Design a binder for this molecule. Structure first.
Ligand SMILES: [Mg+2]
Ligand SMILES: [Mg+2]
Ligand SMILES: [Mg+2]
Ligand SMILES: [Zn+2]
Ligand SMILES: [Zn+2]
Ligand SMILES: [Zn+2]
Lengths: 481, 321, 481
C-alpha cells in the first residue's frame, strides 16, 4: 500500500537492526536480513537501500544506516550525534519513498521518536507551491504506537521550522510585510487562543517615533507593518515575558547602496530574522509552554527610489539616539534599533533578537553555527545547550567595547550603521545593536550563514533553511520546565 | 612581543627566510645556552619529503629554510615537549593566484605565524621555564615565476596525502601541512601551530581576538585564561566535520587547499590543517586579524602588532608552574 | 558474483524489455517482470531500479529506462537519440553497480552494442589516480556474444575519449609538455607499429623558425616540445594525409596578461586541443583505418616571469607574418599560427586543428556543441554527420572577412592576437588562424565549451569531458570507408 523506513546500525557479530526492523524481519521470516546480505556491503550512516516486495502491505522497505547504536554527545561537534544520525538517515529514507512516488510512509522510531520525526519532516519539505510540476505529497506517520508523544514533538518542532522555511523561501512579491503578518497571526491563533496579534501600520510606527525603522521602509511603496505577537502561557498573566525581536526586510536590494545582481534573489530571505523567531512562538504556543513570550518584528522592504534612504543620513531612533546611515544596505541595524527599544517596554527577562544581518557572519562560521553575541553567559549557555540537543548549532561571538568604539565615532551623529573599517563585520554590527539595548540578558543571533542549505545539513533539501528555529523552541521549552 | 613586531614589520627583502632564522637562533641562544638551532636547507626539506612546503617555495629564487628551535627547560631531558609550529611566508604575493596591489605591502607580515611563536620560545627560555618546547617554522616566499606553483596542482605532503592547489594564495595551508606532520615526530604534549592564514578571520572577529580552533577544550581553556591575564584575547572557532567535508571532496586529490564555497573561511582552512594532525591536543591560531594595530589596542603604536605572543608566553609559564 | 544492467522501454500493453532482459526474466521465471510491478512506477529514460537476489549469480540486476524503442535521428537535437538514451541509461546503471562496490558487471546490448559500451565506459570513468580513496574498479563486459565487434567499437571509442579525459584532467605539474608526449607516443605505438613519433625539442622548433610558439613557451622554465604523430594507414604510403593540429598549453595562467584566481585550476586542460585530436589518432590506429593521419601539437606553458611574453610584442610566425601580442592570454592563437603553417608541408587533404581557444565560445553555445569554423561546407558536413551519430555535437560558426578585418588592422604588425573589439570572440580568433592557413579544407574546432562536464552530458561524470574525440574518430572512420 505504502512504504516503510527501517533502520540498522554497524557491527557486533552481524549489524543489529532497530527493533521495528527486527520485528519486521521476523514477520517476513528473516528474509529482510537475508536480502540485506545478498544486496551488497553494509549501510554506514545516512546510506540507504531499497528492498521491494518483502511485504504484502509494504512494497518498499528502505533500510537506512543509523551509525553507532551508542553514538552520543560529541565534545567536538557540539551536539548529540545519534539524533544527528537518525535525522539524516530517515530523511534519506523518506526522500526515497517520495521518489518512488509513494504518498504515505511509515517510519522506524529508531530509538529516538523525536529525531526520526524531525528527519522525516525536515527531510521531506520543499515549497512546491509555485511549480505545477510537484513531487508526491507523502504522508509520514510513525511506525508503532508505544512512543507517540515525542514523535509528535518531532513533527511539531520540524513543522515550526518548515514554517520559517516557507515564510523565507516565498518570493517577496507574495510574502510581503502584510502577508507575512497575516500568516503568522493565523498560525499563532490556530496554535492557541491565549494570543493577541497586532499588525500595527505606519501610523502607529510613526506614533512610536520609530524614525530608524521608518527611514528604511520609505524606499518601497510596500507598506511597513510593525508586528506584535503574544502568547500568554503563564498561569499568572503578570509574569514578565521573554521577548523575541526579528528583522523583517521581505526584500533587500541594498537600496541606494545597491546590491550586485549576483544572487540577489536570496534577499527574499532577509526576513528570516522575523520568520525564525515567529515560528518559534507559533511553536511554543502549540507546545503550550508556561511562559509569556512576545514576538516583535519590523516588516518592511529595502528599495531604491526618489524617496529612498540616502547615504549620509542621520535619522532618529525611538530612544533619542541618531544614526549616520552611511550604507543603506546596513538596514537591519536600523529596523532593529527600534524594535529593540520597544522590547524594553515589555519588561522582558530575556530579549532574544534574531536577524539575517551580515554577510560577514557567513564569511565567519558559514552555516556551521548561527553566530550569537550576548552580554549574558547564562543566556549563551542556554542557547548552546539547546543547540547540543537539536543539532542546530550556535557559536558565541564577541561583544567587546573594541567593536562599539568603531561604530560609535561618528561624524554627524550618535551611532554609525557601518563601523570605521572592513574588518570584524558581525561584531561591529552587533556592537551597533547593543547601543539600543540596556537589558542584562540580551542575545543577538546573526542567521546569515544559516539562511540557506545545499547539502551541509543532510536532512534539509536545497533552499531556505529556516535555522535556528528548533534551538529557539527547545530553549523556551527548557526555560519553561 | 616587540621582537615579533620587528620580525614581522621589517621588509621581506631584508627579513628573509634566512635572516629571520639568523636573528631567532641568535635570540634563542642569548636567551639560554640550553638550546639548539637548525636552519635546515632545501636538501633536508627535500629529504623530509616535504613536498607541500617545497611546492610553495619554488616560485621565489629566495631559499627555503625549515627552522628548528629547541629549549630544554626540563630537569629530565626526556620529558616530551610542547611544540610550536608557525607559518613563515616572508612575503606573500599570492603567487600565480596573485594579489591586488591594495595594501599588499602588509604581506611582509605573513611570517607572523613563525615570528609569534618564535618570540614566545625566545621568551620562555629567558624566563627559563621547566619545560622543553620545540619551534618549528617553514620559512619561504610566495612569488610568481616560470616555475611557480600553478593552479590545479596536486603535490604530496610528507604524510602521504595529496593536495589539489587550486589557489596558490592558500599556501600557509601547505607550508603547514608539513611542519604539522613533522611536529608529531617529537612526541609533543600540546601542538600549538600559529599563522596569519585567512583574511576571513579578519572579517570574522578582526583584531578583537585571535581566533583559535582546537580539538581540545582543555587546551582552549588554557589559551583563554592566559588571554584573560594578558589582555591579548583569543576566541574559539569551530573545527567541525561540516567544514572538513568541503575541503575533503576533491577532484584530483586527497585534500583541496580551498574548500567547496566562499563561506566559513577560517573554519575551512583550519579544517584542512586537522587532516595533517592526529594529536589530542592541537590548536590552530589564526592571527590574520591581529597582524596589525592602528588604535584598537591603545598601547601599541600603528604597524605590525605582534599578537598573541604574551598569551602564548603566559600559557607556557602557567603550564610550567 | 557480479552485477547486471538490464534495459526496458516505455508502454505498448506492458513496457517491453530488451531481449537480454526478456531472456533473463524467463530465466528467473518471470519474477524480474513481477518485482518491477511490485516496486513502483515505470522507468522513463535514464532512470534506474535495483533488484537484488533475482539471480544466484547476479545479486544485483539494475533495470534502466531506454526510452522509446523506435527513438531515432532527431531533427532538432541533431543526433541519433536511441544511442543517446542507451548511453545515459547504462551509464546510470553502471554507476549503480560501482556504488554497490561490484567489481565486475555484465551489460545489456540494448539493441546498440556500441552505444551501451560507450555508455558503460564513458559512464564509469573518473581519474582516481591521485586520491588514495578511490571507487571500485568495475569491469564491464558485454552481456551475450552475438554482437561483439560493435561493443568493442564502443569500448574503443569511449576509451580514446577517456584517454583525452585523463590527459586533460591530470595536474599540469604531472602532465607536462614532455609527459603528455611520452604517454601519447606510448599510446600510439601500442595502437599500431605503423607509427613514428617525434617529440621535437626547442632546438628543432628554433630551427623551424616557429617564432610565435616559442614566444609563448619562454615564460615557463618547462621545456617546449613540438610533437609529431604518424599513422600510416594507407596501403600506398604516398597517399597525402589528414592532419590534425592541437593546442597544448599544459597550463595557462594568462602570462603577464594574467588570469583571475577564480577557477584557474581548469587551465590544466588548455591542452585539450592537443589531447582530443591525439586521442583520435591513437584511436584511428587501434581501428587501423586505411588512411595516413598526422598529429601535430605544440606543447608548452603560459607563465609570468622575468622573460615572459610582454604586451605589445611583435613576434614572427614561421610563414613570415608578424603578430602584435596585445594580450598574452590569447596564446593558443600563436602556438597555432605555427603548427598550422607546418601542417601544409605534409600536403594534407583535410587540416583539422582543434583547441580550447576562447571563453567566448563558452559564452556562445557552451557545452551543447563544439563550435567549428571551416572554409569547407564539405568538411562541415562531414564533422556534423559524424556528430549526429556520436552525439557529441558540433555547431558551425562564421569565418567571415568581417572578423578578419578586425584582427588584421594592426598598429605594429601584420596580425594582432586579439581583434579591435570585445564582440564576436571565437570568430575573431578563428579569423586570426585562417591568416596562417591557405588550404581548401581547413577546420577550426574551438572546444572551450566542452572542456568540462557536470551533468550536461549524462553519461560523463564531473570533470574534464574530453570532447569531441569520438566525433573526430567517427569522421576518420567514415572518411576511410
Ligand atoms: Mg542589507
Ligand atoms: Mg596567501
Ligand atoms: Mg589563454
Ligand atoms: Zn538586510
Ligand atoms: Zn599567506
Ligand atoms: Zn590558452
Amino acid at each position: 500500500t505504502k512504504g516503510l523506513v527501517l533502520g540498522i546500525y554497524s557491527k557486533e557479530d552481524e549489524p543489529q537492526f532497530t527493533s521495528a526492523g527486527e520485528n519486521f524481519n521476523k514477520l517476513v521470516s528473516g528474509k529482510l536480513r537475508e536480502i540485506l546480505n545478498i544486496s551488497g556491503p553494509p549501510l554506514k550512516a545516512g546510506k540507504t537501500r531499497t528492498f521491494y516486495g518483502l511485504h504484502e502491505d509494504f512494497p518498499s522497505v528502505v533500510v537506512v544506516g543509523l551509525g553507532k547504536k551508542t553514538a552520543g554527545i560529541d565534545e567536538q561537534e557540539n551536539w548529540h550525534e545519534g539524533k544527528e544520525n537518525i535525522r539524516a538517515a530517515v530523511a534519506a529514507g523518506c526522500r526515497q519513498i517520495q521518489d518512488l512516488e509513494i504518498p504515505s510512509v511509515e517510519v522506524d522510531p529508531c530509538g529516538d521518536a523525536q529525531a526520526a520525526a524531525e528527519g522525516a519532516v525536515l527531510g521531506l519539505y520543499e515549497y512546491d507551491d509555485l511549480k505545477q510540476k510537484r513531487k508526491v505529497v507523502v504522508s509520514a506517520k510513525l511506525h508503532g504506537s508505544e512512543d507517540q508523544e515525542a514523535w509528535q514533538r518531532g513533527v511539531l518542532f520540524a513543522s515550526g521550522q518548515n514554517l520559517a522555511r516557507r515564510l523565507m523561501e516565498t518570493p517577496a512579491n507574495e510574502m510581503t510585510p502584510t502577508k507575512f503578518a497575516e500568516i503568522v497571526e493565523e498560525n499563532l491563533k490556530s496554535a492557541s487562543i491565549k494570543t493577541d496579534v497586532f499588525i500595527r501600520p505606519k501610523s502607529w510606527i510613526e506614533e512610536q517615533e520609530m524614525g530608524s525603522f521608518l527611514s528604511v521602509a520609505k524606499g518601497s511603496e510596500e507598506p511597513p507593518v510593525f508586528l506584535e505577537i503574544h502568547y500568554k502561557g503563564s498561569p499568572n498573566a503578570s509574569e514578565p515575558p521573554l521577548v523575541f525581536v526579528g528583522k523583517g526586510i521581505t526584500f533587500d536590494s541594498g537600496g541606494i547602496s545597491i546590491k550586485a545582481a549576483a544572487n540577489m534573489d536570496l534577499m527574499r530571505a532577509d526576513m528570516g530574522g522575523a520568520a525564525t523567531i515567529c515560528s518559534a512562538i507559533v511553536s511554543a504556543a502549540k507546545l503550550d509552554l508556561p511562559i509569556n513570550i512576545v514576538g516583535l518584528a519590523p516588516l518592511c522592504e529595502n528599495m531604491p527610489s526618489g524617496k529612498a534612504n540616502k547615504p549620509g543620513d542621520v535619522v532618529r531612533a525611538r530612544n533619542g539616539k541618531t544614526i549616520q546611515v552611511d550604507n543603506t544596505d546596513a538596514e537591519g541595524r536600523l529596523i532593529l534599533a527600534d524594535a529593540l527599544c520597544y522590547a524594553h517596554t515589555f519588561n522582558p527577562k530575556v530579549i532574544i533578537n534574531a536577524a539575517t544581518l551580515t554577510g560577514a557572519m557567513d564569511i565567519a562560521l558559514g552555516s556551521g553555527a548561527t553566530g550569537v553575541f550576548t552580554n549574558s553567559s547564562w543566556l549563551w549557555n542556554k542557547l548552546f545547550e539547546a543547540s547540543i540537543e537539536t543539532g542546530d548549532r550556535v557559536w558565541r561571538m564577541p561583544l567587546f567595547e573594541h567593536y562599539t568604539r568603531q561604530v560609535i565615532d561618528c561624524q554627524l551623529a550618535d551611532v554609525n550603521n557601518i563601523g570605521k573599517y572592513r574588518s570584524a563585520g558581525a561584531c561591529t554590527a552587533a556592537a551597533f545593536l547593543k547601543e539600543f539595548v540596556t537589558h542584562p540578558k540580551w542575545a543577538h543571533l546573526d542567521i546569515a550563514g544559516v539562511m540557506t542549505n545545499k547539502d551541509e545539513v543532510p536532512y534539509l533539501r536545497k533552499g531556505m533553511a529556516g535555522r535556528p528555529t528548533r534551538t529557539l523552541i527547545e530553549f523556551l521549552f527548557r526555560f519553561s520546565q
